[PDB]
Every structure is written in C-alpha cells, then in structure tokens.
Design a binder for this molecule. Sequence first.
Ligand SMILES: Cc1cnc(NC(=O)CCC2CCCC2)s1
Length: 293
Amino acid sequence: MEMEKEFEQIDKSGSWAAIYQDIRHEASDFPSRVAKLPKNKNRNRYRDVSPFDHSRIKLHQEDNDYINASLIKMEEAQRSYILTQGPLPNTVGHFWEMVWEQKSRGVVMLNRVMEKGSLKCAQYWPQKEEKEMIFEDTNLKLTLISEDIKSYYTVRQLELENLTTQETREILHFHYTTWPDFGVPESPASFLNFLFKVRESGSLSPEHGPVVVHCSAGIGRSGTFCLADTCLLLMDKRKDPSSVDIKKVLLEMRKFRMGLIQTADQLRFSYLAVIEGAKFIMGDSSVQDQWKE
Ligand SMILES: Cc1cnc(NC(=O)CCC2CCCC2)s1
C-alpha cells in the first residue's frame, strides 16, 4: 500500500502495536559473540543491546578492538551510517578513536546527558573553548571551536587532533536537544528541520566516512533518524515514490543492528516524518520555511 493511506488505515483501526510486533517477529537474528565476551562487559551500556559480529565497527587496536557500534550500509540509497550507544565513562576515548579511524565528518546526538533524573551518556565533548579534553588511552585531543544554540538544537564545531601524527580535522556536532523524556514529539517539524541541517552540512555525503549517530542505546531515536533519511532519499531517486515501503526499509536496516525503532509510537512517528517530509522533497520549498517559524 502507499504510505499516507496505510497510515490513516492503521490509525482508524488502532493496530500500530500489531504492525510493530510483526516487525519484531520478522527481524533478523545474527550472532553477537564478541559483545558478550567477559572482558567487554564494561563496554556495553545495556546487556540486551549489542552489535552483530558481521557489521560491528572494529577499533584499530590489537589489544581489544571492541566498541558497541554497527555499520548500517544502505545499498540502493547509497548512504551509510554508524549507529552507536552513548559513550560510557570508560569508552569516551574509544568513541573518538572510531570517529578518527572511520573518517567521519559529523556526529549526531539525539539525547540529553541527563534524562528522567539519570545519566544517559557521558559528557564526551568540551563545554568551553579554553578547557580542551585529552584522551590518554587513545592519544587524541579535542577542542571546542564554536557553539550555536538554537531553540530545538545546538551545532558545535570541534577540532580533533591525533597526537601521534599531529594531524587535525574539523568535526561537526549536531545535538537535538528537545526530544521529550517520555513518548515522541507531537509534530515532526522540528525533527525534519534538524535532519535537513545535518544534510546541508555535507556530513552525510559520500566524500566523507559515515556519520556517527547515537542516543542512549543507539537503536530507538537513532533508528528513527536513519530510517526517515533513507526513506526520503529513495523517494527522490525512484521513478515511482509511492513504491517506498517503510516497513521493508526498516527490516533491511535491522539486518545490520538489532532493535531499531523501540516502540509502536516511534514507528508511527517515523511514518509521520516521512509523510510530511515528502512534501518538500517532491517540490514545495516553503514547507521547510513553515517548519522554521
Ligand atoms: C550537557 C547538557 C546540558 N544541557 C543539555 N541539554 C539542554 O540544555 C536542553 C536545552 C533546553 C533549555 C535551553 C533551551 C531548551 S545537555
């Protein structure tokens, strides 16, 4: 079926939970043996969220190459993403090592450091220009260059230096700051404006390594971001945009990382975002402008 009318048909029949459980039943199951080794217990935030062996990002380190991160490679859309958990106190150095080694330009953060009165991720970037961070285990230096705070998100420019070689690179940090503690946003307008800002930066383009995207576990909000981006790109590329099937795209992405889209509400929100976003992608320019005021 098409998307917008399949949407109305699920709303009127109140069957989002049944649709979402079908996806869970059909999703791939692959081994995650490295993630479960005893030496890696303090490298995982949640015991039931692990990267598959076949798609895990390996650190270029002979001692222990493990990080809870997955490469999602979307062949038809020609887009790749690294999805990862929010860094832990003992994995902040690994995180920036991965960014360096994979040649990423951008980092997309979809959570706040504290939510629901608990820590959802470490403070892994500097908050003042004059107070830089040094990661001694991986030999990297990270400096805040600028910060632009907007109503729904913040953009930062960061400098990452490999202290072994004295090479430096500019990394862009895109921080969505307004996802509610419970549930999903009421309108997708600010989330879509945020996605377009990431796109406009060059961070998603083939001339760079894959963008790194994270929330707390790296499957829920993170899955919503890449699912919406990939579906909108396919609708631009194909002759028949109504042939894009969001459930089939989600099952393809779940071949590379488990658990993407954590609730039936997140599934419904992803449909909403693609539907409203299609309005700009197929020709009406002001659509981005209605989102922006
Ligand atoms: C380390 C962090 C500290 N604060 C974080 N998030 C925010 O402050 C959300 C922004 C809200 C209030 C200001 C405008 C809307 S992450």
